[PDB]
């Protein structure tokens, strides 16, 4: 099993929400084996890939977070070498590494706003309302297809702070009504 390789970012740089591929299939395959990745990394939200899976990962106060169901127990490739997991919790579906060289980090939310925004692998910013600790209702029903591959991605409050990490979609008859996420509180207890 190779290392997770950062293959793009979801950009909230300026006044538009958009994804950028920064590596291709073959070169990803090459980098996973060794774990040595020179590539220019930027930003808070990374697109990350394994041999079979592509998903998201979000840096929040110096730690890159994602889902175990995506990342398994794998290292993540870095300029120096494979980077071992800092945090690992299979029940929470959570893994964390040190935040990558080049990254920015989001700040945990302190607002307690319930208006939230899920950022997807397609670079859509989808509005969500807080349902409670770890659930949030989409204002606009989507098929599961649409959200698939956006695990590891942030739910942001209106200040652009992180509320949590997208974990799963609450679906009936193929339609996501709500989403499940790992709250920052739970990260900050995991830390
Ligand atoms: C729509 C996008 C959605 C974010 C995505 N997540 C999933 O697909 C998860 C993974 C798996 C099933 N998922 C679901 O979302 C299901 C599904 C019907 C399939 C939508 N929904 C669901 O259970 O609803 C129940 C209320 C919630 C209860 C919570 C479920 C538990 C979460 C979960 N935890 C663990 C911990 C450890 C494991 O060890 C290997 C494995 C796990 N697997 C898990 O669920 C995603 O995009 N992934 S991804 O990016 O495509 C892939 C590359 C990584
Ligand atoms: Zn906030």
Query: Which residue has the CA at smallest separation from atom 9 of ligand 1?
Result: 168
What's the CA dihedral at 161, 140, 14, 164 to 10 degrees?
Answer: 20
Q: How far is the CA of 176 from the centre of ligand 1 (A)?
A: 12
Q: How far is the CA of 176 from the centre of ligand 2 (A)?
A: 24
Q: Name 64's bridge partners.
A: 59, 97
Residue 48 and residue 135 share a domain: no
Which of 106, 135, 151 represents a domain boundary (last residue)? 106
Q: Is 169 in the pocket of ligand 1 (CB under 6 A)?
A: yes
Do 117 and 156 contact (CB within 8 A), yes or no? Answer: yes
Q: What is the total residue count of the chain?
A: 191
**What does the alpha-carbon distance between residue 38 and residue 61 come to, in Å, rounded to a whole number?**
23
For the record, the structure tokens of 116 come out as: 């939230």
Which run of H or of E encompasses 139? strand 135-143
Q: Which three-class secondary structure state does DSSP give residue 53?
A: coil
161 among annotated binding-site residues: yes
Do 93 and 127 contact (CB within 8 A), yes or no? Answer: no
Other Cβ atoms within 10 Å of 100 Cβ, number: 22
CA geometry: angle 129, 55, 155, nearest 5 deg: 20
Q: What is the CATH number of the domain that holds 150?
A: 2.40.10.10
**What does the alpha-carbon distance between residue 124 and residue 156 come to, in Å, rounded to a whole number?**
13
Do 138 and 147 contact (CB within 8 A), yes or no? Answer: no
Domain that holds residue 181: 107-191
Do 28 and 77 contact (CB within 8 A), yes or no? Answer: no
Which of 106, 129, 156 represents a domain boundary (last residue)? 106
Helices and strands (H, E) in the chain, number of each type: 4, 13
Q: Is 55 in the pocket of ligand 1 (CB under 6 A)?
A: yes
Q: Is 122 in the pocket of ligand 1 (CB under 6 A)?
A: no
111 among annotated binding-site residues: yes
Residue 58 and residue 35 share a domain: yes
Which of 49, 76, 106 represents a domain boundary (last residue)? 106
The number of angstroms, rounded, from the C-alpha of 116 to the middle of its chain's C-alpha atoms is: 15
Q: How far is the CA of 187 from the centre of ligand 2 (A)?
A: 16
Atom of ligand 1 nearest to the CA of 152: 50
**What does the alpha-carbon distance between residue 143 and residue 33 come to, in Å, rounded to a whole number?**
35
Atom of ligand 1 nearest to the CA of 56: 50
23: left (phi over 0), alpha (psi -120 to 50) or beta: beta
- Work out how many domains the chain is built from and give that number: 2
List the determination method.
X-ray
Which run of H or of E encompasses 168? strand 162-172
69 among annotated binding-site residues: no
Q: How far is the CA of 120 from the centre of ligand 1 (A)?
A: 15
What's the CA dihedral at 51, 52, 55, 57 to 10 degrees?
Answer: -30
**What does the alpha-carbon distance between residue 163 and residue 156 come to, in Å, rounded to a whole number?**
5
Documented resolution in Å = 2.0
Residue 93 and residue 114 share a domain: no
Atom of ligand 1 nearest to the CA of 166: 4
Q: Which three-class secondary structure state does DSSP give residue 160?
A: coil
Q: How far is the CA of 149 from the centre of ligand 1 (A)?
A: 10
Q: What is the CATH number of the domain that holds 37?
A: 2.40.10.120
């Amino acid at each position: 099993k190779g290392s997770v390789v950062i293959v793009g970012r979801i950009n909230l740089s300026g006044d538009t929400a958009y994804a950028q591929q920064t590596r291709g299939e073959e070169g990803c395959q090459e980098t996973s084996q060794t774990g040595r990745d020179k590539n220019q990394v930027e930003g808070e939200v990374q697109i990350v890939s394994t041999a079979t899976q592509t998903f998201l990962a979000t840096s929040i106060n110096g730690v890159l977070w994602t889902v175990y169901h995506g990342a398994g127990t794998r290292t993540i490739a870095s300029p120096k070498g494979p980077v071992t997991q800092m945090y690992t919790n299979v029940d929470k579906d959570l893994v964390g590494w040190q935040a990558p060289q080049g990254s920015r980090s989001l700040t945990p939310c302190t607002c307690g706003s319930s208006d939230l925004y899920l950022v997807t692998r397609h670079a859509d910013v989808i509005p969500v309302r807080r349902r409670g600790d770890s659930r949030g209702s989409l204002l606009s029903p989507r098929p599961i297809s649409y959200l698939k591959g956006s695990a590891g991605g942030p739910l942001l409050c209106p200040a652009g702070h992180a509320v949590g990490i997208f974990r799963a979609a609450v679906s009936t008859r193929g339609v996501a009504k709500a989403v499940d996420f790992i709250p920052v509180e739970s990260l900050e207890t995991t830390m």
